[PDB]
Amino acid sequence: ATFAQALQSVPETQVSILDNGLRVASEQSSHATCTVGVWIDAGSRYETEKNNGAGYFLEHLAFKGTKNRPGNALEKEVESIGAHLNAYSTREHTAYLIKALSKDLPKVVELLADIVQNSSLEDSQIEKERDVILREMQENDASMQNVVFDYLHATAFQGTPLAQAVEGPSENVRRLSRTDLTDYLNRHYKAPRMVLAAAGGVEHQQLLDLAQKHLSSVSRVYEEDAVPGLTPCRFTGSEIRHRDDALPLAHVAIAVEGPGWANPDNVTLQVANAIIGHYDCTYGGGVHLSSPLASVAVANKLCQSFQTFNISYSDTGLLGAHFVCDAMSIDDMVFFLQGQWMRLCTSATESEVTRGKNILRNALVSHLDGTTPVCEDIGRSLLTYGRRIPLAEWESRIQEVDAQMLRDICSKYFYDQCPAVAGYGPIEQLPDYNRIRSGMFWLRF
Amino acid sequence: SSKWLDGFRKWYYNAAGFNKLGLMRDDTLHETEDVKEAIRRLPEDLYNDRMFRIKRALDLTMRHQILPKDQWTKYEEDKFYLEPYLKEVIRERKEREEWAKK
């Protein structure tokens, strides 16, 4: 069987629209377990720096009780069937998802009926979640990777709603009140911004009947009739450097502005990342990895680990690399990393393009294994693209990438650009911004 | 090839003159990356024997002396200890080069 018709044998996601504008999408497979979730366009980018932690505080409180099921009884409704109830919030998308069995498919929709509609916010829960979130961020600032990524968003998107963290500053956490959470729920938990996704052993018609009978009362109507626009954000080439020499080793991330979701050359950028890839100190290949950055990083013992990311948002994003290493090699890692980017702008040959295409194909198919990743892709794709892209379309878009358009796209996005730098730890040998800006181009080109 | 080529090989082995410093053939090989890797892959006994023979040769060439004729390394008793390791290193380098070609 050829890969194309094997990819065509995957069942298609079925999408339908209620009269509220809420989208309902399902994908059917042969599993005995299903994953049902609600995806809302309500992140930290929709906040106005006085409700900067409203989404995090709400997603803390969302499993603490409704106006019909008071508190822990809701927990029993999840725990007496073995379902796993989960939630997360990015800067743009907020998901409440749950994994259960198929026989419990109606009743569990009931939970997603009243999690996003009839949340009850008791005040004792408000101060309890207030100091829980305070010690949660006091725990989370120890993780240097989250600190570096939040610093990168702070220095890359200065003065924009996309710089602020999902959790927000500590002063708002001690300042969010009941009415502000009510206003956030009224403005952002509306009907046309919500996608009910299901993956696994579900049928689309039964899911539609349950979705109608439960979520037909979601608002669709505005409070003050003022549409919250999702404005463009100004990327700013800059640096931020937090020097703390007591830390054992440093985390450094360098990014440039990338296109987002709607631009198809994102797929080309993914192949570029698949040329450079990732490396960790606990790998197995050694010096014989195909990535030249990883091979030189294990040959000279430069870094503890590095990875490449392509983070996207509405018409914007970040595209770059993040490495943790000891201090004495930091600039050398930068030099080698920058050199790899310049090769992808100048000397891209078909062998590494074929290798990166194969890596992206295998990673893309193997990522969509499991009802929870399939439901995540359905909800995120209908929030971002407005439709679910079948994997055959992804295969057709991948197959059109050769070396010429790869180095064209990489010269567009990487060559002679102003990056955003975020360093944390013993970063004295991290070079000054003029050295990185000089490393963004070659004099031999 | 039968009659005198082996005899000419014996005469050339006597004439080249590393046998009268106690050296074997593979001690005389100039280091490259391949030869250094093949030396690095040697076991401890052959490595220590090689390094002692090399510094004995340097001691003898300091004083402009040679070994006594009974201590000259014999042509038949000369073992080619290094060249399987060197051939394996050359083979894997050629594999890496032909992969880098395509």
């Binding site: 829980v132 949660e136 725990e139 830390l247 606990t282 790998y283 197995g284 290949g285 | -």
Partner: protein, 78 residues
């Protein structure tokens, strides 16, 4: 018969420890010297647990299973 170290005949210097702040005229026999040993590898700062919500799920319930890979990070799952 006091002097608990001298209660044990051969186990006098094992039960006791005798540092010398100012070393006198006579040197002790077996001066002793540490070998230049190795160093442990460096690791990043870990995740502390300061609340009940973060600690949930951290208690082990299944046997320890380790996994290595050629280009995937090494992991351990409980």
């Amino acid at each position: 018969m006091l002097s608990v170290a001298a209660r044990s005949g051969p186990f006098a210097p094992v039960l006791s420890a005798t540092s010398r702040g100012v070393a006198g005229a006579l040197r002790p026999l077996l001066q002793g010297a540490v070998p230049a040993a190795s160093e442990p590898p460096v690791l990043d700062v870990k995740r502390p647990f300061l609340c009940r919500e973060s600690l949930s799920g951290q208690a082990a319930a299944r046997p320890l299973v380790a996994t290595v890979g050629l280009n995937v990070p090494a992991s351990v799952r409980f």
